[PDB]
Design a protein around this ligand. Structure first.
Ligand code: COA
Ligand code: COA
Ligand code: 16G
Lengths: 180, 182
């Protein structure tokens, strides 16, 4: 594991924060996430900073080997299409929040790009401290900057009001699943 | 534009068709999609086989240069994660149906893979020929074969009964969208 980021950290900096609509108090931003905190791409050393401990609060992570993580990480990085983003408490050296933006390429809408928000979770001790809003507003604006024609996500009905804060609305389409 | 497929066509013969749950009458399969038809990966030469005319029946699919199409194709090919699959009517040399399987990589569920079914459309003159069922069944089984832990898709409630035929069920989760075009 090293400090190589999954994607160019500047992409987070250069998001047009003027387009944010979510309310912050105090007014944190991608460049100013809160003292002692950094908002950045996942890097391979994050395996040892409790990345999986955070993800484990959302759903099951099973047993993951360093080699398994490295291979997944390298594939994601190589694609250019995966924006796994974390908030790290630098004083503790621990990940405290994560969210992923995935870019999908299509042929419809003039060879469009489409965004998906995945795997959004704030560590329990850090909930209600604006990090979910920060992650969501930053990644949503990043997809618009990357020329996505739309961005989508799925959530339980109890979380709908949260995502509304970044301009998401409930689609008429149903989400259908088959589990193997 | 050439005949090179987006993915290994062998993968379509390796789908365990005995696991298909949808009812077909007449019996057709990935191997035998019907007389005059071939189910196969997209290739760049499909640009000139009416590929976009089919997509245009799904949603807006406007102006695209040959180089833009080839760039998207190569990018999709290079990832190994895109399975844009077509049915061609060989007598006419025209695409008559398309569906895409995308493989998404995760860190959850022990660094799992999950499938997405996207951009499913049969040309209206070929509907009721079981080509939509063929594509859905094949891609669903292919995702299983590729060790996805699940596969998902979104559709208007008006299409729910179609996807039920392949073992999909309506999830409790809401689908949410921010449209940057309107
Ligand atoms: C808790 C969670 C949903 C929100 O993140 P958070 O950091 O705790 O929330 P924030 O402090 O960033 O934002 C708080 C704001 O969102 C609102 N909010 C929080 N949860 C909400 C919900 N479920 N529905 C509607 N609004 C919600 C609060 O009222 C507050 O509103 P306001 O500050 O605008 O007045 C977070 O994303 C999380 O990890 N939760 C548990 C795992 C999870 O459910 N992940 C999402 C999978 S879809
Ligand atoms: C029309 C479409 C959805 C299905 O393809 P098709 O050629 O009509 O269907 P097939 O001949 O392969 O399968 C026919 C079966 O599916 C059923 N079916 C077709 N459309 C259906 C729908 N919208 N809802 C429920 N069932 C449907 C038929 O009743 C028939 O049932 P049966 O097998 O018991 O006889 C097709 O994929 C299409 O291009 N439609 C318009 C574009 C579109 O909406 N794409 C899907 C977006 S989520
Ligand atoms: C299974 C399936 O085919 N689902 C499609 C989706 O894949 C496609 O991208 C979208 C286009 O509609 P849009 O132009 O409004 O984004 O329609 C449906 O939701």
């Amino acid at each position: 594991p090293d400090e190589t980021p999954m994607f160019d950290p500047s992409l987070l900096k250069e998001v047009d924060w003027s387009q944010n609509t979510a309310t912050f108090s105090p007014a944190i931003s991608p460049t100013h996430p809160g003292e002692g905190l950094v908002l950045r791409p996942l890097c391979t050393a994050d395996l040892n900073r409790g990345f999986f401990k955070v993800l484990g609060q959302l759903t099951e992570t099973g047993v993951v080997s360093p080699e398994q993580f490295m291979k997944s990480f390298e594939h994601m990085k190589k694609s250019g299409d995966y924006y796994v983003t974390v908030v790290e408490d630098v004083t503790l050296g621990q990940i405290v929040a994560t969210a992923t933006l995935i870019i999908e390429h299509k042929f419809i809408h003039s060879c469009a790009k489409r965004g998906r928000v995945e795997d959004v979770v704030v560590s329990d001790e850090c909930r209600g401290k604006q990090l979910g809003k920060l992650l969501l507003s930053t990644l949503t604006l990043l997809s618009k900057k990357l020329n996505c024609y739309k961005i989508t996500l799925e959530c339980l009905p109890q979380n709908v009001g949260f995502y509304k804060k970044f301009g998401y609305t409930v689609s008429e389409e149903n989400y259908m699943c088959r589990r193997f």
